[PDB]
Design a protein around this ligand. Structure first.
Ligand SMILES: *[C@@H]1O[C@H](CO)[C@@H](O)[C@H](O)[C@H]1NC(C)=O
Ligand SMILES: *[C@H]1O[C@H](CO)[C@@H](O)[C@H](O)[C@@H]1O
Ligand SMILES: *[C@H]1O[C@H](CO)[C@@H](O)[C@H](O)[C@@H]1O
Ligand SMILES: [Ca+2]
Ligand SMILES: [Ca+2]
Ligand SMILES: [Ca+2]
Ligand SMILES: [Ca+2]
Ligand SMILES: [Ca+2]
Ligand SMILES: [Ca+2]
Length: 317
């Protein structure tokens, strides 16, 4: 047939071709109503018009390839040119070229991802692909991710013109270090200049009980007078747990390894961690005491920290 290529979205009056010269048709053989226009085997609006004065085919209306052909790779208008004296029918095909007049667009602007802190590196997360109503090179080609030490993208060709996008955990997460990672995902087409679309991804690091309680010091040394009354404050122990909520909540207790006698002599407060004197003290009975104290989590798997209190009884009278 006769074939022309017209880029979409040209303003009316743009020249397509010289039809009369191409088909060897004298202008006298052309008249009103001599141009028929078809799309997909059905008649269509006057996207094109033929000038009877110079035999030129030109753009008569806005031609939007996206509306016409959507995602189909080829966009073709079928024309019939009708001549008389003698009667002749010439078929013309007009290809509508795609331009990069659309940007890549994600279905949503904001995405939220929940990842447990225990999740090990090399884990992979589904992320939704962007869409670009253009075709070929003008459609989505590459993705890039905002700078992150923890996450990277994997982009793989899948079919003819679509790709698989995967979010990959490259480095371990630590909620105590950072609880929320802000990521921007950018989709880019292959048009020149390239057009972009972005989506925000918020990565929330869920807490695991991966920290055990810890005292400021391993060992405490205290001098206690033997005549110290019961309820006397021996020492205030401070333990801390950086985990979240129940996982960082501590209860103080004396270790089971402590002797029965010491439990009678000494007591510790479960919440505050104040070690106090319970029973009367005798330097003759004992020169020293060794109290083992532990602090425990309220997490699903309770975690513990330990320290030793060394009590020096001071002789009186
Ligand atoms: C525990 O913390 C309190 C509050 O700052 C402080 O007064 C006390 O000395 C601390 N105890 C120890 C053993 O450091
Ligand atoms: C759209 O914009 C992004 C940055 O926002 C570019 O990286 C891309 O190449 C396109 O120009
Ligand atoms: C992602 O970022 C681009 C460029 O900052 C915005 O234009 C877009 O709307 C989204 O916020
Ligand atoms: Ca268009
Ligand atoms: Ca287009
Ligand atoms: Ca595009
Ligand atoms: Ca941690
Ligand atoms: Ca934790
Ligand atoms: Ca903990």
């Amino acid at each position: 047939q006769l074939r022309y290529s017209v880029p979409e979205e040209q303003s009316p009056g743009a020249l397509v071709g010289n039809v009369a010269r191409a088909l060897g048709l004298e202008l006298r053989r052309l008249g009103p109503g001599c141009l028929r226009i078809n799309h997909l085997g059905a008649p269509s609006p006057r996207y094109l018009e033929l000038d009877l004065t110079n035999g030129a085919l030109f753009v008569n209306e806005r031609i939007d390839r996206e509306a016409l052909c959507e995602q189909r790779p080829r966009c073709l208008l079928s024309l019939e040119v009708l001549a008389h004296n003698p009667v002749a029918v010439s078929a013309i095909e007009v290809e509508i070229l795609d331009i990069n007049d659309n940007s890549p667009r994600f279905p949503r602007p904001d995405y939220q991802l929940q990842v447990s802190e225990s999740v090990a590196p090399g884990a992979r997360f589904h992320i939704e692909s962007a869409q670009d109503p253009d075709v070929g090179a003008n459609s989505v080609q590459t993705y890039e991710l905002s700078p992150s030490e923890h996450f990277e993208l994997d982009l793989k060709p899948l079919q003819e013109n679509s790709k698989v996008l995967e979010l990959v955990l490259r480095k371990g997460l630590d909620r105590e270090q950072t609880a929320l990672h802000y990521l921007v995902l950018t989709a880019v087409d292959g048009g020149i200049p390239a057009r972009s679309g972005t989506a925000q991804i918020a990565v929330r690091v869920l807490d695991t009980n991966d920290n055990s309680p810890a005292f400021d010091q391993s060992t405490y040394r205290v001098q206690l007078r033997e005549d110290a009354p019961p309820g006397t404050l021996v020492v205030k122990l401070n333990a801390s747990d950086p985990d979240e909520g129940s996982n960082g909540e501590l209860r103080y207790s004396l270790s089971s390894y402590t002797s029965d006698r010491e439990r009678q002599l000494f007591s510790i407060d479960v919440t505050t961690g104040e070690v106090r004197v319970s029973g009367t003290l005798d330097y003759e009975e004992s020169s020293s005491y060794q109290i083992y104290v532990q602090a425990t989590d309220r997490g699903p798997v309770p975690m513990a920290g330990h320290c030793k209190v060394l009590v020096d009884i001071i002789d009186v009278n």
